[PDB]
Write an enzyme that holds these catalytic residues in place. Structure first.
Site, PDB file in Angstrom:
ATOM      1  N   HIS A  15     111.811  30.607   8.467  1.00  0.00           N
ATOM      2  CA  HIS A  15     111.068  30.870   7.201  1.00  0.00           C
ATOM      3  C   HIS A  15     111.190  32.337   6.739  1.00  0.00           C
ATOM      4  CE1 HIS A  15     107.467  31.498   9.977  1.00  0.00           C
ATOM      5  NE2 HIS A  15     107.326  32.529   9.156  1.00  0.00           N
TER       6      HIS A  15
ATOM      7  N   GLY B 271     101.028  37.867   9.630  1.00  0.00           N
ATOM      8  CA  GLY B 271     101.571  39.121  10.192  1.00  0.00           C
ATOM      9  C   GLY B 271     102.095  38.959  11.618  1.00  0.00           C
TER      10      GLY B 271
ATOM     11  N   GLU C 101     113.094  25.861  13.746  1.00  0.00           N
ATOM     12  CA  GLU C 101     112.390  27.045  13.155  1.00  0.00           C
ATOM     13  C   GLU C 101     112.902  28.345  13.778  1.00  0.00           C
ATOM     14  OE1 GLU C 101     111.035  26.695  10.387  1.00  0.00           O
ATOM     15  OE2 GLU C 101     110.178  28.731  10.131  1.00  0.00           O
TER      16      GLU C 101
ATOM     17  N   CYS D  33     104.079  36.339  12.745  1.00  0.00           N
ATOM     18  CA  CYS D  33     105.330  35.537  12.834  1.00  0.00           C
ATOM     19  C   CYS D  33     106.445  36.425  13.378  1.00  0.00           C
ATOM     20  CB  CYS D  33     105.680  34.798  11.541  1.00  0.00           C
ATOM     21  SG  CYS D  33     104.484  33.467  11.203  1.00  0.00           S
TER      22      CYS D  33
END
Ligand SMILES: COc1ccc(C2=CCNCC2)cc1
Length: 182
Positions: A41, A146, A72, A148
């Site tokens: 992402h 914040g 991911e 990730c």
């Protein structure tokens, strides 16, 4: 404070950079040579900022399992003049549950942040922001925006990178040794 935080700190001090994309600042884990990982992402392009230096992306691969399901994890090769310490021997070979994990973050907003998250479940399937996702680890800590890219470790193992939360639980994508064979 203790040997969990000791291992986490050793990884953060040598094997992390601050990555900036058009989608924000992320903790980024360097694994070996010029190869690092970031949540998919983050939307890595042809250029990324690494510790505020403009850096060409030589390759970027958003990983999926052999069911063609999102993992991911994006593996990035960076056009830089230096190599990361090789930490591939700290990666698990198989999907597993863990005790006594630490989530560590380093960004402009959250420098030198370490969170004892406790027990980590092999959760497996998660609908993450609308996207079916496999190999998710879960921990019962109320992680916020914040975090990730944050690194999940135990003593002696680097097991995942933080990719989301539901306000009560936090979720990490597994890191496996097999993602980084050359
Ligand atoms: C392949 O790109 C790299 C590799 C290493 C670094 C680091 C700089 C400072 N602390 C150690 C890690 C930065 C970029």
């Amino acid at each position: 404070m203790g040997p969990g935080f000791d291992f986490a700190q050793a990884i953060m001090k040598k094997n992390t950079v601050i990555a900036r994309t058009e989608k924000g600042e992320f903790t980024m884990l360097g694994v070996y040579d010029r190869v690092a990982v970031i949540p998919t992402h983050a939307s890595v392009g042809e250029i990324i900022y690494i510790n505020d230096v403009e850096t060409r992306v030589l390759d970027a691969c958003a990983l999926r399992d052999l069911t063609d399901t999102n993992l991911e994890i994006t593996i990035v090769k960076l056009d830089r003049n230096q190599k990361f310490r090789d930490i591939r021997h700290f990666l698990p070979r198989c999907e597993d549950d863990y005790n006594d994990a630490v989530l560590s973050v380093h960004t402009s907003k959250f420098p030198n942040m370490y969170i004892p998250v406790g027990q980590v479940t092999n959760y497996g399937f998660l609908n993450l922001g609308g996207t079916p996702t496999h190999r998710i680890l879960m921990y019962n800590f109320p992680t916020r925006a914040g975090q990730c890219g944050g690194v999940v470790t135990t003593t002696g193992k680097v097991i995942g990178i933080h990719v989301g939360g539901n306000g009560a639980q936090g979720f990490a994508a597994m890191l496996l040794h097999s993602y980084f064979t050359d």
